[PDB]
Symmetry: C2
Subunit: 263 residues, 2 copies
């Protein structure tokens, strides 16, 4: 029949790749997708679940962030009573900051998304604590809204006091903006400044230069959400809260801060 999917705006490409993964596994089981989008209001998520239930939906998947206060499967970390399938956002942000630390970077600036995002502090903690174990004082942290515009605006703000050799952006779109700012001011990536992103949206392998980023397996995430929801539909206990490991994809946007041999 139909699966209802609650998501943010389609301008966020990570979540958009989750919709592609949901659709592929749902189509494989004869299920259509019923789309409902929300915008920051926490009661919009609850109201969306109502409307989908009014429309005789067999199951609901919540891609949008919502701290939880037909069967339902959330795609973020919720209480253990709520069925979840999520990606370790803390681990992802550690692998990225530790990768930059391993290459010799010490001043790694962080550009996060909105801080109301439940796991945006889980990204901040992975970055801050990685610099903790390395015994380093925290560099600049700036705010974006998952858009390339804010990534560009955050990077030119960091460029006002250029005391950084790497930028970790909380998603690929913001990272694209970061690259734009650095290429405009004539700084080379990765020779002058390394950039690391989050999500592995298909476009990030074709940025200039190909972006090193933390891959959330959106396709597997959408697959596991449909599989858990389908078992609950056909009568089964909710499978345990599942957490997917993020992978760091190293491409061309990252290098040691200076040349290791010829300085």
């Amino acid at each position: 029949h139909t699966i209802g999917v609650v998501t943010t705006g389609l301008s966020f490409y990570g979540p958009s790749q989750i919709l592609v993964g949901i659709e592929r596994a749902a189509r494989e089981h004869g299920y259509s997708l019923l789309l409902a989008t929300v915008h920051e209001d926490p009661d919009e998520v609850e109201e969306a679940i109502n409307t989908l239930r009014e429309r005789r939906v067999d199951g609901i998947i919540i891609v949008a962030p919502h701290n939880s206060e037909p069967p339902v499967v959330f795609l973020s970390a919720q209480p253990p009573g709520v069925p979840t399938v999520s990606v370790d956002q803390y681990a992802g942000a550690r692998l990225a900051t530790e990768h930059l630390l391993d290459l010799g970077h010490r001043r790694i600036a962080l550009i996060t998304g909105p801080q109301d995002w439940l796991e945006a502090r889980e990204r901040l903690q992975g970055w801050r604590e990685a610099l903790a174990e390395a015994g380093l004082p925290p560099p600049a942290v700036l705010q974006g809204d998952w858009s390339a515009a804010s990534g560009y605006e955050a990077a030119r703000q960091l460029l006002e006091q250029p005391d950084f050799t790497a930028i970790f952006a909380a998603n690929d779109q913001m990272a694209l903006g970061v690259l734009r700012a650095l290429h405009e001011r004539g700084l080379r990536v990765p020779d002058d400044v390394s950039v690391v992103g989050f999500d592995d949206i298909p476009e990030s392998a074709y940025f200039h230069p190909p972006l090193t980023t933390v891959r959330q397996d959106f396709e597997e995430l959408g697959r596991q959400a449909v599989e858990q929801l389908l078992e609950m539909i056909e009568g089964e206990e909710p499978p345990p809260p599942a957490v997917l490991p993020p992978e760091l994809i190293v491409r061309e946007s990252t290098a040691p801060p200076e040349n290791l041999y010829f300085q």
Copy 2:
């Protein structure tokens, strides 16, 4: 009931995503929910996408271009159960014509075209539009290759075109493909716009943060979606649609085009 079905290209592609944003907003504001019928690789899926929306007793079907020009989309509109509204931007491709006139007025004579999948009638009609426009201007036929709207196919099509590097301008049917075009050229050591001019289509928010910033055709995708909902609702409830406020297509000139280096 209280559900609108949409035959659409996949959410992986950001042109059709922007259109779906307007559809979902306008349908929710009128009490309807968006049910998805995604066409992936072949226009033969348009018939099956219509019957899948009919199987869920949807009140009305929106068929987004280029799927509306397919024969089984005309038949469903003639059947009228459930009512069917086409979404398209109606010479015939004024947006593309702006790209053509932009490249010609710069002096470009040898154009390379990276189109969408040629299986659709609109894609072949768009290709003929370029051919007729180039012939009327006294230009040789363009070099033509087929993408699949993804940045990968944009990158791969450009590399095959570069095996015959006689062109000075490339038009990419969407901005994602143009992103792969830029990377392929920068790998081959070609400068944009100095060696090769690149133009895209759809004004995706990331366009201004490509390297170089990408000249592109902006179409009012969101309003086109709202207008499709208000027209389908005239067929369902008899509700009078508001006055049409769709802005015409607009070429967004940036930094990706320049006169040909030849002369």
